[PDB]
Write a protein that binds this ligand. Structure first.
Ligand SMILES: CC(=O)N[C@@H]1[C@@H](O)[C@@H](O)[C@@H](CO)O[C@@H]1O
Ligand SMILES: [Ca+2]
Ligand SMILES: [Ca+2]
Ligand SMILES: [Ca+2]
Ligand SMILES: [Ca+2]
Ligand SMILES: [Cl-]
Ligand SMILES: [Cl-]
Ligand SMILES: [Cl-]
Ligand SMILES: [Cl-]
Ligand SMILES: [Cl-]
Length: 130
């Protein structure tokens, strides 16, 4: 085993899928505590692997835009990288009325992405090197 117990190995990364929900900031903290990061989707092949094993619930990834531009937590370039947005997303929606727009990306159960309110308790995926 190249990955720790409770982690899944795929193509030179280890992944951990939560069975619980946290805000994006608390999930980011959790992953960093484990010497990992919220998942960064680098390719269609990795998107297919992650979406196949989602827990049938909205799930945070390591993609956010609170200071204006979309950034991956590990510095992977967003604009030249893989994208898989739901139709009409991202929309920085304000109409939830919770304050501000929407600055954190998550998967829908089908794998397509949405921007949502960072404070929402969603599932998350951690990713580390082998
Ligand atoms: C979970 C989900 O996709 N939520 C979105 C939300 O982020 C916003 O984009 C809204 C605009 O009408 O459409 C949906 O409710
Ligand atoms: Ca992180
Ligand atoms: Ca990755
Ligand atoms: Ca935004
Ligand atoms: Ca949205
Ligand atoms: Cl958990
Ligand atoms: Cl897209
Ligand atoms: Cl709006
Ligand atoms: Cl937000
Ligand atoms: Cl909520």
């Amino acid at each position: 085993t190249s990955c720790p117990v409770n982690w899944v190995e795929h193509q030179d990364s280890c992944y951990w899928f939560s069975h619980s929900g946290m805000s994006w900031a608390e999930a980011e903290k959790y992953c960093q505590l484990k010497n990992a990061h919220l998942v960064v989707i680098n390719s269609r092949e990795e998107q297919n692997f992650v979406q196949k094993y989602l827990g049938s619930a909205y799930t945070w990834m390591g993609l956010s835009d609170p200071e204006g531009a979309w950034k991956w937590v590990d510095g992977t370039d967003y604009a030249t990288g893989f994208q898989n947005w739901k139709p009409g997303q991202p929309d920085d929606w304000q109409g939830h009325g919770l304050g501000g727009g929407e600055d954190c990306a998550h998967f829908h159960p089908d794998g397509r992405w949405n921007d949502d309110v960072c404070q929402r308790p969603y599932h998350w995926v951690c990713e580390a090197g082998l």
